[PDB]
Design a protein around this ligand. Sequence first.
Ligand SMILES: CN(C)CCCN1c2ccccc2Sc2ccc(Cl)cc21
Ligand SMILES: CN(C)CCCN1c2ccccc2Sc2ccc(Cl)cc21
Ligand SMILES: CN(C)CCCN1c2ccccc2Sc2ccc(Cl)cc21
Ligand SMILES: CN(C)CCCN1c2ccccc2Sc2ccc(Cl)cc21
Ligand SMILES: CN(C)CCCN1c2ccccc2Sc2ccc(Cl)cc21
Ligand SMILES: CN(C)CCCN1c2ccccc2Sc2ccc(Cl)cc21
Lengths: 307, 307, 307, 307, 307, 102
Amino acid sequence: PVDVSVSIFINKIYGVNTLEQTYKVDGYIVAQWTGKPRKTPGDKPLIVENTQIERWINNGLWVPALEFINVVGSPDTGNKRLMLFPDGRVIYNARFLGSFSNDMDFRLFPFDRQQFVLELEPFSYNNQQLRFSDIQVYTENIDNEEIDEWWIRGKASTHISDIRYDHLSSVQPNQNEFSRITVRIDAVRNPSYYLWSFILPLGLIIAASWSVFWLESFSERLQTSFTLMLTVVAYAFYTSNILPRLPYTTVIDQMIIAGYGSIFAAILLIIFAHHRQANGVEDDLLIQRCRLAFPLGFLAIGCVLVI
Amino acid sequence: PVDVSVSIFINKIYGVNTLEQTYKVDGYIVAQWTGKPRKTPGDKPLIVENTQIERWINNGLWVPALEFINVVGSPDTGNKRLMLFPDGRVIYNARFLGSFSNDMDFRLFPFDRQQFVLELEPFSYNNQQLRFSDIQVYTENIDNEEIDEWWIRGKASTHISDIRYDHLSSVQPNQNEFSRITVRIDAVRNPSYYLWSFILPLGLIIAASWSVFWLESFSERLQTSFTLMLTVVAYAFYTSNILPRLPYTTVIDQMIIAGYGSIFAAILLIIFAHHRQANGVEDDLLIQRCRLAFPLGFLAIGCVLVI
Amino acid sequence: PVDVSVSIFINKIYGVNTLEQTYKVDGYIVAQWTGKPRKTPGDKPLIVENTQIERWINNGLWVPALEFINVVGSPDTGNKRLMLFPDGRVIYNARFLGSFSNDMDFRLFPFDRQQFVLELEPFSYNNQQLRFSDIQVYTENIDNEEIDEWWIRGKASTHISDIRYDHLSSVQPNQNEFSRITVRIDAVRNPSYYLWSFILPLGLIIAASWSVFWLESFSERLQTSFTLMLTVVAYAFYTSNILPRLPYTTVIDQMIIAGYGSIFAAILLIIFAHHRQANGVEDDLLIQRCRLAFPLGFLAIGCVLVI
Amino acid sequence: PVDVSVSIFINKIYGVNTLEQTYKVDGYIVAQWTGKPRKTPGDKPLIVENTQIERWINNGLWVPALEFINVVGSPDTGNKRLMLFPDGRVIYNARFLGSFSNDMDFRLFPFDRQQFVLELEPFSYNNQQLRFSDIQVYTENIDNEEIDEWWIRGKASTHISDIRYDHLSSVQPNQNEFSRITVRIDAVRNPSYYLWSFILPLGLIIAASWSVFWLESFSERLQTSFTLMLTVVAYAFYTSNILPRLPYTTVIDQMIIAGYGSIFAAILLIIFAHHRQANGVEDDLLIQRCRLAFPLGFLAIGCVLVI
Amino acid sequence: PVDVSVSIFINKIYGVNTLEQTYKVDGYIVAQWTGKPRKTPGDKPLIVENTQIERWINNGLWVPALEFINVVGSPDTGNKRLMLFPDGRVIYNARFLGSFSNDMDFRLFPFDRQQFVLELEPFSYNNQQLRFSDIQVYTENIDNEEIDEWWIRGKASTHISDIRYDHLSSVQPNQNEFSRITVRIDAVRNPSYYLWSFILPLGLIIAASWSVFWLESFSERLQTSFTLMLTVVAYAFYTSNILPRLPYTTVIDQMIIAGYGSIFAAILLIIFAHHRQANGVEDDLLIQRCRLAFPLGFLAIGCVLVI
Amino acid sequence: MDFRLFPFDRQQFVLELEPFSYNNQQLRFSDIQVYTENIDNEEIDEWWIRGKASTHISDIRYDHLSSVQPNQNEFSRITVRIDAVRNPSYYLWSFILPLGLI
Ligand SMILES: CN(C)CCCN1c2ccccc2Sc2ccc(Cl)cc21
Ligand SMILES: CN(C)CCCN1c2ccccc2Sc2ccc(Cl)cc21
Ligand SMILES: CN(C)CCCN1c2ccccc2Sc2ccc(Cl)cc21
Ligand SMILES: CN(C)CCCN1c2ccccc2Sc2ccc(Cl)cc21
Ligand SMILES: CN(C)CCCN1c2ccccc2Sc2ccc(Cl)cc21
Ligand SMILES: CN(C)CCCN1c2ccccc2Sc2ccc(Cl)cc21
């Protein structure tokens, strides 16, 4: 029941696809397993590069297909080599680049925590078993990820479990448990760019929105309101175009509704101030001095969005 | 007249293409059919992985090409294995990723009901017949589909019918019936994001549009109208850019016309109020108090949009 | 001089590319031609699927390369079969998906008439001749094409002509005429979406533009003009982004200039009204009552845009 | 030292890529060269289609790899045939589609002159020499290209020169000159669409910008300026999105700065008028009558942009 | 321990991908290494083109797989030839096009300095050693890079170092040092386009923003502020859409915050001016004459952004 | 230096640095800082530099008496090379031309 050692060198993780819940991983994979001894030229181990490998299989060299369970579509394989040893053992080494899938919650958008994962498992073998898994990452955190998009937190999580597959296990009674290496790296999004260039401007806009109450007239207030309205619609548009498209509301996306809100509540106040009067036309004395009472009310409701 | 058992494990449905009426499906397919017994090494069944399979065909192993009738372009095949059994039976197992086509009505829009479908049928065989179909989906609904885009309603819809193809059935008299497995999954779009972030803002915009009648002057009313106009055009653009492009009007798209409408109706009243007079310049007394009569008229016309 | 029968099943025409003058067509092609009789296993005709076909060619089976004259780049071929008959005749059957080219005039944009076309012709044969062509389309019109983008008018246009190719016909004296099947389907664009959601809003905008003459002041008129100016630029942008990019002016694109026009003519009038006077400042009495004379002049010029 | 005749049929030139300086060309290529006579079936020349060609090379048929020096990435080869003649001569014929590169100056912009080019040269042969080159285009100019994007001026430029490659010419002393066919067709951009739909609207906007001086007040003038400012920013955005992205300023791009300029110059004037006075607040009498002096100054500076 | 000479002809570097930190490089690679002498037809060296090469390996011709360490996905190989010499030496010559990865700091932005890099290294050989590396670039700078996006500063830079790979070096004791050629070209971004068309317009906008202090009223000042606000949001959108997307703030991106800043500070002053008074309503005399004190304060803070 | 195209030269000025007695002491990275400008003042100056920065840092074999120390005789050599063009003004304006007239 073959023991297989596996090593995964991860070279680059890039191009998240928020909508498809998808990321790209470039790296090498290495499998090692000891077979029946053989005679090699010299006694040096033998090297078999690319095209030559498939020919060695036509002569009964077994090389197991190891599938990336969580890759979306067959990956781009660059180079592959076999290392056939005189004492039997065999090393398969190949570089890969593949788009891998995992569940990704982006609802806390500019402040994400994500988990990029590789799942390896033999394509047709249940008593060929993954001996031990080793993942070699060569980076550093917190560091260059001001230039880079993501903050890795954890280093190395491995598993190597057994998968059941209870469906048509009568196709082969008593044996349908496959050996699955699971590799998972934890990462955090770099919330600098999105605050310094999206969160902050929106707040200033929402703040300056409240300055509508320091307009003297009423016509001034209500008319100006509509310009604020436009300002948000403009800023929502700017937001939507550049930010990653999703099927839920992000934190930024919530703040954008808060804008739409404060402004439309202003209009109501601005108008109800006018027509809650003692005569026909007296703006209600205290009410349009919600000048430093809208900011408080907004900030109070902006402390329950957090919890 | 060969019996073929089929099983389809569905791994992920993603990337709808509203314009092309198209979706992507990643999963495995398994075919089982009993052939002339053979000697396998040992008596254990024989495994034939990838490249090796095509070689077994060159020696007279028959393996039927099973076509995805409704796939748009030949799909990406990842790994394939044969399981040759000593008692004859044979298992073809392969992972696929393909862009599939089906009719899709998106007119409702953010409140969709769609039907993702697979159609399998042998490419050149009419008395080789699909024994039974089993589809294995491993998800859950109503559930994680706040993080996910779609709400599946049904689980398992199957078909296994006979297709006629009456065109040049004299090419082979009396026999042109192909066995077609049809698999169809029902799903609902998640109408959260689009309400919370598109429907609602537009309503507020349309609502605040009506507040034009609470402007005192006429110049104030008529001038402000044009800013409301701009506000809709802005919001139509924002809408159009982010939402899926289609060749018909969505619900949102109608609401956008309702905006364009109310605002232009306002303009007419606002102006007709001014010149429907007893003197040269008297704004008509009751009319510019359609303040809480436009909201009713719009809302009345917005309850016949539903039925 | 070989006779070849051809039939073309058209499964889907999708993804027009206005700039490249290009459309996508998914379907099957079948060629039939009678060769030297042969012995098949049993007496049942022999089936040769995919990879196996190329092997049968290495043994001297002639299978002509049929080229799609007007396909842009070699198409995606999915499955192919040979049907070798004991009495000689041979059937080639294969599914294709390809991006095809044809001349396409889009100057009447939302109200198009187009002609989607396939041109088939053998790649190296002049006395192998296309016997008869049959095209099998299974749709219906006027019908589901509210859900679908296009309205097919004609059904079946076929040709099968002979192409001259007079360049280096001394490479082979007296014989350079190739047999070219021409298939062409006529279709009309569904002008609903573009009217109900683009043409109409623009008209309301242009209409409301004229309401500028019902402003009392001159400062009111001239200033408001600049907001109208903004509105068109906004609406031009919205138009351009969503509509298909082209190298000529569409109908919509002209109407957008008509907007740009009426508004800039207003400014001139609005200003010329102010200074075409008897005293220093008298707005010319009749002129700023081109209130219901710009609409007529615009509508008069909008009845010569048609013829 | 083999003589090779070449003919290039150009079927379609489409999809310019302004940033990459890149275009697509679909067409056929034909190479002819006389070899050692051979026995053909019959005495009719022998036809060898596609896959079969590579098999004939395995038996010592020499077929020179002809490289497209200026193609970006190996091109899409559609169909290929050999024509083996009994008298020796051999004809290679294949259809190609490839993305070709050339230096492209887009600074003029909507009034471009460009030169689309093919450069052919053998990949490993210096005394195999391109006998004569022939290019077959079947179009017409001026004519259609109101429907088409480009105006071809010249017809046929050919070269067939010798390339030096002085780098490691000691790898093979005395012989490193390769025979290079050069084909180049000259074309002009169709400056209708961009004038009628971009150039023109911008001028009207810039013109209407100047009408700011016919506002009576000063507050009217200065405030309106900012709407003009917004108006340009709006139109700059519209321009940028639709027009081809570049790393230099186009003519349109300059015109857009001219807008930004006149409007900001207006602001300066409008304000300097107010505070260049004999009292505290007297708008300078002649200066705010730069009404028909800004138009002249702009048009004067717009006649030195040309030379 | 094989000596390998390498030459790299670089034809074109294009299509930077700011987000993925990625660039495209098309060129040829040449490897030369002297093997056991052989008999060639004639005594002329033998040429082996494309497909024929792979056949020569099946007969024991060793051709080392040389990997591009920093290429993202296996590159597009166009044509390849072997030049087998009678005296043993062998030349591998092939054209490639590949997307290569390198670290790229885009924070400066329109005034970038970048370093485009190739890393070549044998895929399975440590005592096969890269003798010497030669890179052939044929351009000129400062020069056409007004038409071209980038200004190359340096010419060459080579390395040829030894890489350790200390992970599972017990797989082969005492020998795991691979020979890596490193090529790096230095380049500068051409900051003309981004200054002349982005930096400048923004400044004029920000400058004209300050002209808000020369408005007479207070209602005029505060209301106009909101139009300036809109103007920046507009310009941010325009900026964001066209400029390369990044995960950090560019220089332009900072300037956009400076706009958002000055305008919101204006609002505060404009409002604080009104209610820092001796009576109920006296605008503070000196303060609203920060007319030529905001420009200075902004320019003072804009000289600490540099250092 | 090839001077056969004299008044119209292209030359390559080069530095080669390498440790005098060390093979596993290795030149980590090389950086060369030139502070000039071209085409420019080189009407006053004799030469026109074209390229800026060429570096190498290779390993030199020295296969002669490598048994003096078996298995280790590869020295780390920085190579720096600058490309330059001769200023063909003076020699044309004052030599080429007069001779043609003659
Ligand atoms: C600043 N350094 C974190 C840069 C590394 C960025 N990189 C990455 C990118 C996007 C999402 C997640 C990751 S994690 C990761 C794990 C291994 C390796 Cl080799 C690279 C990465
Ligand atoms: C929403 N949760 C049910 C998650 C499922 C998302 N996913 C999906 C996406 C778009 C449209 C339809 C579906 S159904 C489906 C069926 C099987 C699998 Cl494996 C994935 C999916
Ligand atoms: C609207 N119903 C006619 C549905 C068909 C639409 N479809 C189509 C799409 C884009 C452009 C032209 C066409 S025509 C056509 C011809 C044959 C077939 Cl099989 C499909 C199509
Ligand atoms: C009607 N005529 C304008 C046709 C020319 C259009 N087409 C083209 C497109 C973009 C850039 C350059 C060209 S030139 C050209 C040369 C040969 C052929 Cl076959 C087509 C073209
Ligand atoms: C003015 N000419 C130097 C243009 C250089 C543009 N091009 C380039 C593009 C993007 C990043 C780096 C470079 S460098 C380079 C090196 C060789 C060649 Cl062939 C082209 C380039
Ligand atoms: C116009 N500038 C090129 C003047 C430089 C002349 N100078 C020089 C002289 C003879 C041959 C080559 C050079 S290059 C060079 C590189 C660096 C420095 Cl610091 C001086 C020089």
